[PDB]
Ligand SMILES: [Mg+2]
């Protein structure tokens with residue numbers, strides 16, 4: 001039986017010369033056993049859901065700040081840094097954004113002059129949203145996910161841009177405007193990130209690289225790349241992760257690991273173990289080895305890596321469970337962290353604290 005997280009060495013203290021150690025949180029997790037773990041180990045947090053666009057402006061002019069504010073207050077109370085996730089995404093984003101003045105979806109418009117008017121209207125809505133949120137949180141936020149997941153996994157166009165509703169209506173302009181507007185209101189010292197998953201694998205990595213270089217060439221203010229790092233035990237390789245970070249560092253950009261979890265399964269995540277107890281020890285040991293290697297790499301690259309955030313706290317709450325259940329007939333349990341569901345340490349904890 002392993003000791004509780006609050007009886008072992010602080011991970012934030014361990015990594016204080018190298019990078020922040022962060023966790024994704026929900027407002028209901030800032031008390032009790034999760035609050036205890038968070039205060040002991042982490043010096044950074046991010047909102048899992050409460051700061052996404054639909055969570056902040058669910059209808060036009062109506063802002064819902066309470067969940068977000070609760071997360072900011074916790075960060076402030078405990079001297080934590082704060083990532084803002086996220087100003088722009090194609091999911092968890094309110095429908096009203098993309099309706100024209102008559103109330104119909106902008107993608108349905110065919111008349112060229114009305115499409116141009118719709119584009120202008122959407123970019124204006126984007127600016128007001130960004131302005132309002134940034135004005136509220138600029139003094140608390142230490143890194144912004146300005147845009148999230150705007151690069152595609154395939155090659156639908158030559159630039160590899162995701163053809164979401166944002167792209168369909170504005171092309172790449174929404175990305176430009178998001179960074180320009182964030183810089184404008186948050187000030188020159190705000191750290192502006194483009195965040196994405198599979199930043200380690202081609203062709204996506206190269207599309208992202210090319211995007212960043214294009215935008216930099218046009219003077220668009222991008223300070224860093226967010227590597228979601230939703231990874232597996234054997235995939236991606238240590239070298240693929242290294243090469244990605246080194247590429248972006250080479251452009252003068254900061255790297256952050258933003259949503260790290262180490263799944264016990266492949267993609268798709270099957271076969272999955274039906275419960276936490278059914279998970280065999282080898283999986284935790286294999287995961288410990290993986291975590292060791294990751295964090296040695298992270299330390300090696302610490303001149304170009306400022307923060308490492310896990311997409312959760314302990315194994316009792318992870319979006320990876322939803323995924324497991326989805327490909328295993330409604331039953332499955334993943335275990336991605338260094339703390340187990342009872343907040344006791346796992347083998348991976350020892351292997352990254354040493
Ligand atoms: Mg180690």
Ligand code: NA
Nearest residue numbers: 018302305306
């Ligand atoms: Na660093």
